[PDB]
């Protein structure tokens, strides 16, 4: 509270570390469904069903332009990518599978990078 400061983790490397994780995401072989925004004019349903579209290139742009206040807002957008994917795709589809795989890949890198 006021004048009662909690000790707080060093956050000076967060931007660089998030960029690094995002690069590992981008270069994963199952990243292809998520590299670019879904084409809202070629994909039926998507615009109406998915209220907040998100993809790696949009995350990269936001990261590169200081639009994440902290690492948690970054993780929220990354998870949003995979939550959208689950909403729109069958688990037993290539894209569905890819989403699960990439989510797992992210969360381990997240834990290993920041959870001490
Ligand atoms: C034609 C199908 C298609 O373009 C598509 C289906 N699901 C998705 C998607 O969820 O991208 C992440 C794209």
Coordinates of N, CA and C and ligand atoms in Angstrom, one line a residue:
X1 N 0.8 -1.2 0.0 CA 0.0 0.0 0.0 C 0.9 1.2 0.0
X2 N 0.3 2.4 0.2 CA 1.0 3.7 0.2 C 2.3 3.6 1.1
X3 N 3.4 3.8 0.5 CA 4.7 3.8 1.2 C 5.1 2.4 1.8
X4 N 4.4 1.4 1.4 CA 4.7 0.0 1.8 C 5.0 -0.7 0.6
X5 N 6.2 -0.7 0.2 CA 6.6 -1.3 -1.1 C 7.0 -2.8 -0.9
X6 N 6.4 -3.6 -1.7 CA 6.7 -5.0 -1.8 C 8.0 -5.1 -2.6
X7 N 8.9 -6.0 -2.1 CA 10.1 -6.3 -3.0 C 9.6 -6.8 -4.3
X8 N 10.2 -6.4 -5.4 CA 9.7 -6.8 -6.7 C 10.8 -7.2 -7.6
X9 N 10.5 -8.2 -8.5 CA 11.5 -8.9 -9.3 C 12.1 -7.9 -10.3
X10 N 13.4 -8.2 -10.7 CA 14.1 -7.3 -11.7 C 13.4 -7.5 -13.1
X11 N 12.9 -6.5 -13.7 CA 12.2 -6.6 -14.9 C 12.9 -6.0 -16.1
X12 N 14.1 -5.6 -16.0 CA 14.9 -4.9 -17.0 C 15.2 -5.8 -18.3
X13 N 15.2 -7.1 -18.1 CA 15.4 -8.1 -19.2 C 14.1 -8.6 -19.8
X14 N 13.0 -8.2 -19.3 CA 11.7 -8.8 -19.7 C 11.4 -8.7 -21.2
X15 N 11.6 -7.5 -21.7 CA 11.4 -7.2 -23.1 C 12.2 -8.1 -24.0
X16 N 13.5 -8.1 -23.7 CA 14.4 -9.0 -24.5 C 14.0 -10.5 -24.4
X17 N 13.7 -10.9 -23.2 CA 13.3 -12.3 -23.0 C 12.0 -12.7 -23.7
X18 N 11.0 -11.8 -23.6 CA 9.8 -12.0 -24.3 C 10.0 -12.1 -25.8
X19 N 10.9 -11.2 -26.4 CA 11.2 -11.2 -27.8 C 11.9 -12.6 -28.1
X20 N 12.8 -13.1 -27.3 CA 13.4 -14.3 -27.5 C 12.4 -15.5 -27.5
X21 N 11.5 -15.5 -26.6 CA 10.5 -16.6 -26.5 C 9.6 -16.5 -27.8
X22 N 9.2 -15.3 -28.2 CA 8.4 -15.1 -29.4 C 9.1 -15.6 -30.6
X23 N 10.4 -15.4 -30.7 CA 11.2 -15.9 -31.8 C 11.2 -17.4 -31.9
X24 N 11.3 -18.0 -30.7 CA 11.2 -19.5 -30.6 C 9.8 -20.0 -31.1
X25 N 8.8 -19.2 -30.7 CA 7.5 -19.5 -31.2 C 7.4 -19.4 -32.7
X26 N 7.8 -18.3 -33.2 CA 7.8 -18.0 -34.7 C 8.5 -19.1 -35.5
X27 N 9.6 -19.7 -35.0 CA 10.4 -20.6 -35.7 C 10.0 -22.1 -35.5
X28 N 9.1 -22.3 -34.6 CA 8.5 -23.7 -34.4 C 7.8 -24.1 -35.6
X29 N 8.0 -25.4 -36.0 CA 7.4 -25.9 -37.2 C 5.9 -25.9 -37.2
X30 N 5.3 -25.9 -36.1 CA 3.8 -25.9 -36.0 C 3.3 -24.4 -35.8
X31 N 4.1 -23.4 -36.1 CA 3.7 -22.0 -35.9 C 2.9 -21.5 -37.1
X32 N 2.9 -22.2 -38.2 CA 2.3 -21.7 -39.4 C 0.8 -21.2 -39.3
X33 N 0.0 -21.9 -38.5 CA -1.4 -21.3 -38.5 C -1.5 -19.9 -37.8
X34 N -0.4 -19.5 -37.1 CA -0.5 -18.4 -36.1 C 0.5 -17.3 -36.5
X35 N 1.2 -17.4 -37.6 CA 2.2 -16.4 -38.0 C 1.5 -15.1 -38.4
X36 N 0.4 -15.1 -39.0 CA -0.3 -14.0 -39.6 C -1.7 -13.9 -39.1
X37 N -2.4 -12.7 -39.2 CA -3.8 -12.7 -38.9 C -4.6 -13.6 -39.7
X38 N -5.6 -14.3 -39.2 CA -6.6 -15.1 -40.0 C -7.2 -14.1 -41.0
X39 N -7.3 -14.5 -42.2 CA -7.9 -13.7 -43.3 C -9.4 -13.6 -43.1
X40 N -9.9 -12.5 -42.6 CA -11.3 -12.4 -42.2 C -12.3 -12.4 -43.4
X41 N -11.8 -12.4 -44.6 CA -12.6 -12.4 -45.7 C -12.5 -13.7 -46.5
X42 N -11.6 -14.6 -46.1 CA -11.5 -15.9 -46.7 C -12.0 -17.0 -45.7
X43 N -12.1 -16.6 -44.5 CA -12.4 -17.7 -43.5 C -13.8 -17.4 -42.9
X44 N -14.8 -18.2 -43.3 CA -16.2 -18.0 -42.8 C -16.3 -18.3 -41.3
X45 N -17.1 -17.5 -40.6 CA -17.3 -17.6 -39.2 C -16.4 -16.8 -38.4
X46 N -15.1 -16.6 -38.8 CA -14.1 -16.1 -37.9 C -14.3 -14.8 -37.3
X47 N -14.7 -13.8 -38.1 CA -14.9 -12.5 -37.7 C -16.0 -12.4 -36.6
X48 N -17.1 -13.1 -36.8 CA -18.2 -13.0 -35.8 C -18.0 -13.8 -34.6
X49 N -17.3 -15.0 -34.7 CA -17.1 -15.9 -33.6 C -16.0 -15.5 -32.7
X50 N -14.9 -15.0 -33.3 CA -13.7 -14.7 -32.5 C -13.6 -13.2 -32.2
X51 N -13.9 -12.8 -31.0 CA -14.1 -11.4 -30.7 C -12.8 -10.7 -30.6
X52 N -11.7 -11.3 -30.3 CA -10.4 -10.7 -30.2 C -9.4 -11.6 -30.9
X53 N -9.2 -11.4 -32.2 CA -8.2 -12.1 -33.0 C -6.8 -11.7 -32.6
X54 N -5.9 -12.7 -32.6 CA -4.5 -12.4 -32.2 C -3.6 -13.4 -32.9
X55 N -2.4 -13.0 -33.3 CA -1.5 -13.8 -34.0 C -0.1 -13.3 -33.7
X56 N 0.9 -14.2 -34.0 CA 2.3 -13.9 -33.6 C 2.8 -12.5 -34.2
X57 N 2.5 -12.2 -35.5 CA 3.0 -11.0 -36.1 C 2.4 -9.7 -35.4
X58 N 1.2 -9.8 -35.0 CA 0.5 -8.7 -34.2 C 1.2 -8.6 -32.8
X59 N 1.5 -9.7 -32.2 CA 2.2 -9.7 -30.9 C 3.6 -9.1 -31.1
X60 N 4.3 -9.5 -32.2 CA 5.6 -9.0 -32.5 C 5.6 -7.5 -32.7
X61 N 4.6 -7.0 -33.4 CA 4.4 -5.6 -33.6 C 4.2 -4.8 -32.3
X62 N 3.2 -5.3 -31.5 CA 2.9 -4.7 -30.2 C 4.2 -4.7 -29.3
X63 N 4.9 -5.8 -29.3 CA 6.1 -5.9 -28.5 C 7.2 -4.9 -28.9
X64 N 7.4 -4.8 -30.2 CA 8.4 -3.9 -30.8 C 8.1 -2.5 -30.7
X65 N 6.8 -2.1 -30.3 CA 6.3 -0.7 -30.3 C 5.9 -0.3 -28.9
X66 N 6.3 -1.1 -27.9 CA 6.0 -0.7 -26.5 C 4.5 -0.8 -26.1
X67 N 3.8 -1.6 -26.7 CA 2.4 -1.7 -26.4 C 2.0 -2.8 -25.3
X68 N 3.0 -3.5 -24.8 CA 2.9 -4.3 -23.6 C 3.4 -3.6 -22.4
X69 N 2.5 -3.3 -21.4 CA 3.0 -2.6 -20.2 C 3.9 -3.5 -19.3
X70 N 3.7 -4.8 -19.4 CA 4.4 -5.8 -18.6 C 4.4 -7.2 -19.2
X71 N 5.1 -8.1 -18.6 CA 5.2 -9.4 -19.3 C 3.9 -10.2 -19.2
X72 N 3.0 -9.9 -18.2 CA 1.8 -10.6 -18.1 C 0.8 -10.2 -19.2
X73 N 0.8 -8.9 -19.7 CA 0.0 -8.6 -20.8 C 0.5 -9.3 -22.1
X74 N 1.8 -9.5 -22.2 CA 2.3 -10.3 -23.3 C 1.8 -11.7 -23.2
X75 N 1.9 -12.3 -22.1 CA 1.4 -13.7 -21.9 C -0.1 -13.9 -22.2
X76 N -0.8 -12.8 -21.9 CA -2.3 -12.8 -22.2 C -2.5 -12.9 -23.7
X77 N -1.8 -12.1 -24.4 CA -2.0 -12.1 -25.9 C -1.5 -13.5 -26.5
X78 N -0.4 -14.0 -26.0 CA 0.0 -15.3 -26.5 C -1.1 -16.4 -26.2
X79 N -1.6 -16.4 -25.0 CA -2.6 -17.4 -24.6 C -3.9 -17.2 -25.4
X80 N -4.2 -15.9 -25.7 CA -5.3 -15.6 -26.5 C -5.3 -16.2 -27.9
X81 N -4.1 -16.2 -28.5 CA -3.9 -16.9 -29.8 C -4.4 -18.4 -29.7
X82 N -4.0 -19.1 -28.6 CA -4.3 -20.5 -28.5 C -5.7 -20.8 -28.0
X83 N -6.3 -19.8 -27.2 CA -7.7 -19.9 -26.8 C -8.6 -19.7 -28.0
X84 N -8.3 -18.7 -28.9 CA -9.0 -18.6 -30.1 C -9.0 -19.8 -31.0
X85 N -7.8 -20.4 -31.0 CA -7.6 -21.6 -31.9 C -8.5 -22.7 -31.4
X86 N -8.6 -22.9 -30.1 CA -9.4 -24.0 -29.5 C -10.9 -23.7 -29.7
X87 N -11.3 -22.4 -29.7 CA -12.6 -22.0 -29.9 C -13.1 -22.4 -31.3
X88 N -12.2 -22.2 -32.3 CA -12.6 -22.3 -33.7 C -12.3 -23.6 -34.3
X89 N -11.4 -24.4 -33.7 CA -11.0 -25.6 -34.4 C -11.2 -26.8 -33.5
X90 N -11.5 -27.9 -34.2 CA -11.6 -29.2 -33.5 C -10.2 -29.6 -33.0
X91 N -10.1 -30.2 -31.8 CA -8.9 -30.8 -31.3 C -8.2 -31.7 -32.3
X92 N -9.0 -32.5 -32.9 CA -8.6 -33.5 -33.9 C -8.5 -32.9 -35.3
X93 N -7.9 -31.8 -35.4 CA -7.6 -31.2 -36.7 C -6.1 -30.8 -36.7
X94 N -5.5 -30.5 -37.9 CA -4.1 -30.1 -37.9 C -3.9 -28.8 -37.2
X95 N -4.7 -27.8 -37.4 CA -4.6 -26.6 -36.7 C -4.9 -26.7 -35.2
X96 N -5.9 -27.5 -34.9 CA -6.2 -27.8 -33.5 C -5.1 -28.4 -32.8
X97 N -4.5 -29.4 -33.4 CA -3.3 -30.1 -32.8 C -2.2 -29.1 -32.7
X98 N -1.9 -28.3 -33.7 CA -0.9 -27.3 -33.7 C -1.0 -26.3 -32.5
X99 N -2.3 -25.9 -32.2 CA -2.5 -25.0 -31.1 C -2.1 -25.6 -29.8
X100 N -2.6 -26.8 -29.6 CA -2.2 -27.5 -28.3 C -0.7 -27.6 -28.2
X101 N -0.1 -28.0 -29.3 CA 1.4 -28.1 -29.2 C 2.1 -26.8 -28.9
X102 N 1.7 -25.8 -29.5 CA 2.3 -24.5 -29.4 C 2.0 -23.9 -28.0
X103 N 0.9 -24.2 -27.4 CA 0.5 -23.7 -26.1 C 1.5 -24.4 -25.1
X104 N 1.6 -25.7 -25.2 CA 2.5 -26.4 -24.3 C 3.9 -25.9 -24.5
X105 N 4.3 -25.6 -25.7 CA 5.7 -25.1 -26.0 C 5.9 -23.8 -25.3
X106 N 4.9 -22.9 -25.4 CA 5.0 -21.6 -24.8 C 5.1 -21.7 -23.3
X107 N 4.2 -22.4 -22.6 CA 4.1 -22.4 -21.2 C 5.4 -23.0 -20.5
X108 N 6.0 -23.9 -21.2 CA 7.3 -24.4 -20.7 C 8.4 -23.3 -20.7
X109 N 8.5 -22.7 -21.9 CA 9.4 -21.6 -22.0 C 9.2 -20.5 -21.1
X110 N 7.9 -20.2 -20.8 CA 7.5 -19.2 -19.9 C 7.9 -19.5 -18.5
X111 N 7.6 -20.7 -18.1 CA 8.0 -21.2 -16.7 C 9.5 -21.2 -16.6
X112 N 10.2 -21.7 -17.6 CA 11.7 -21.9 -17.5 C 12.4 -20.5 -17.5
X113 N 11.8 -19.5 -18.2 CA 12.4 -18.2 -18.4 C 12.1 -17.3 -17.2
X114 N 11.0 -17.4 -16.6 CA 10.6 -16.4 -15.6 C 10.3 -17.0 -14.2
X115 N 9.7 -18.2 -14.1 CA 9.5 -18.8 -12.8 C 10.8 -19.3 -12.2
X116 N 11.7 -18.3 -11.9 CA 13.0 -18.6 -11.5 C 13.7 -19.7 -12.2
Ligands
LIG1 C1 -9.7 -22.4 -44.6 C2 -9.5 -22.7 -43.1 C3 -8.6 -21.6 -42.4 O1 -8.1 -20.7 -43.1 C4 -8.5 -21.6 -40.9 C5 -9.2 -22.4 -40.1 N1 -8.9 -22.2 -38.9 C6 -7.9 -21.2 -38.8 C7 -7.3 -20.6 -37.6 O2 -7.8 -20.9 -36.5 O3 -6.0 -20.0 -37.6 C8 -5.3 -19.9 -36.4 C9 -7.7 -20.8 -40.2

